């Protein structure tokens, strides 16, 4: 009847209320439960007068087996609707349907309620949350693409293109090199230590004061030269792809690394000091063939010291 | 009435269709608005041959100020309801009632729908879809706590308490030193150079073959010594916020980090190898006395030292 708990789980529900208005309400739903048997996490009785900190109410949520939402017109005023509440809800919507458990008050009625909830099916009626309590990787898009910006992107990029210029200048790349960073995106996404480990036929050239230079020959023996780096953090998708334990397979890796690849280019496109500075070459790495790599290359680059004409 | 095109944007919609079915009608669709006076990307007459992959579709769907989705029964089973359709969604429900013109076909009804779809309010009867026509920040949880994982946590601490106890054993920090790595989590989500900027009493003592080891005094005088640094990746949401472009505001911070570091939490306790190895410290950077932030690291290795007798 009773379920036993896991490792991280010592309650079977947190009840999530705001004090303001429903801590009667929560009392009532409180003590419906735990005499039933099931152990539960209430703000005012477990949380000392001055630990009711966000970190100490996530702490309880982490330990919960399941969340109680307790969702009346009240709640959604109180900004706890806009905060506390929020925290509880995941971005997975699997993860959703296990775990929260909305108790409905006042006839607020599904259609009210903010888009995460809504499909959720919702809910003496205290006797169906007790049926709830009885007994996943949500989008990277966003996470993976503004902490690829802010911690690297958005420093290196805007006056990357000087620094480019600078090398060519006095190496005599001029017309053989273009100014932006090619950033590669192969689709299975792992990232090999070097972008050279692709072909014997790209040459190591140096680096800028630091992202590696590399050469590449075209069909007339003509040198081609680059700054160019895999995108380090879409390794992280392959290798939750690998991980059995890990909820994502194939089809949700090219979903997820598409996702990824539009959020980047929609921030990239809106920071004028930084679109137009970098290419990101996305590429089906199935090839062997020396040649394979440096075409494709050599096409893109090409491409791009058109555009800079 | 047409309006004019911003950056990226040179196409008023991009036409989503499963080619092995809802083709015709597509191009019925296609047909109605671009006479109008819209210019569209429609798949079969603008993507070549040999390249209708992806990151073609992406490119085109970065490049269409609406994003027209023809889902019809058929639409479903044909896994573009699971892949290329999927791949126009956002996680920001702000960007998708904007962006997203959903067309129904043969009745599915807005229920039918997979979860992101159904709020967004969906739709010779082509005159609506015009309407559509004529003229953000998601979850950031699972990126950020993903990304950390395996591109850090899951490296480092499977065998780092091991590290810490030599480091320690030769060190005579026994019985003053956790074996865990404190993480620490800044409330404001700013990081510094080194957590010893918050206090001079905080004193480096070298490093582990690298994370750095710092000591702490008591109120006995007892130094107390653990590896310690910041969670870096936070500090992107203090940039998100500070930034006047970005949409990301106090109050999101706030809910964002918690989801992170709920999340965070999840990853590294269903990791057997990688759970008690690290404790993250979450608190509010706001005191400037110097004993402050020592009287809270001190708190957390005497409690980490309790769990580990």
């Known amino acids: 009847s009773v379920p036993v708990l896991r490792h991280p789980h010592v309650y079977h529900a947190f009840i999530s209320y705001c004090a303001d208005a429903d801590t009667s309400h929560a009392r009532t739903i ?38 109680i939402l307790v969702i009346s017109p009240a709640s959604l005023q109180s900004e706890w609707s806009k905060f506390e509440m929020l925290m509880a809800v995941d971005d997975s919507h699997q993860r959703n349907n296990v775990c929260l458990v909305p108790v409905l008050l006042g006839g607020v009625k599904v259609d009210d309620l903010p888009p995460p909830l809504r499909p959720l099916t919702c ?15 949500g989008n990277l898009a966003h996470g993976f693409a503004w902490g690829y910006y802010y911690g690297y992107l958005k420093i290196i990029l805007p006056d990357l293109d000087k620094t480019v210029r600078q090398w060519r200048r006095v ?17 299975s996404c792992r990232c090999r230590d070097s972008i050279a480990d692709e072909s014997s036929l790209i040459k190591h ?71 137009k500075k970098c290419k990101i070459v996305f590429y089906k790495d199935v090839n062997n063939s020396s040649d394979a790599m440096p075409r494709l290359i050599c096409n893109e680059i090409k491409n791009q010291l058109r555009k800079e004409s």
């Open 30 to 67: 409180l003590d419906s439960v735990e005499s039933r048997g099931f152990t539960c996490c209430f703000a005012e009785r477990d949380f000392l007068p001055g630990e009711c900190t966000s970190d100490v109410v996530v702490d309880a949520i982490h330990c919960s087996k399941n969340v």
């Open 123 to 137: 809910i003496r009626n205290t006797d169906d949350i007790i049926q709830a309590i009885s007994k996943p990787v």
């Open 171 to 187: 190496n005599n790349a001029e017309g053989r090199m273009s100014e932006k960073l090619f950033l590669f995106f192969p689709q």
């Open 205 to 275: 050239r140096g680096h800028l004061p630091k992202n590696t230079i590399y050469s590449v020959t075209d069909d007339n023996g003509e040198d081609y030269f680059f700054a160019g780096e895999y995108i380090g953090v879409i390794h992280t998708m392959f290798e939750m792809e690998q991980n059995a334990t890990t909820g994502l397979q194939t089809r949700e890796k090219y979903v997820q690394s598409m996702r990824f690849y539009l959020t980047l280019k929609r921030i990239l496109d809106t920071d004028p000091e930084c679109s």
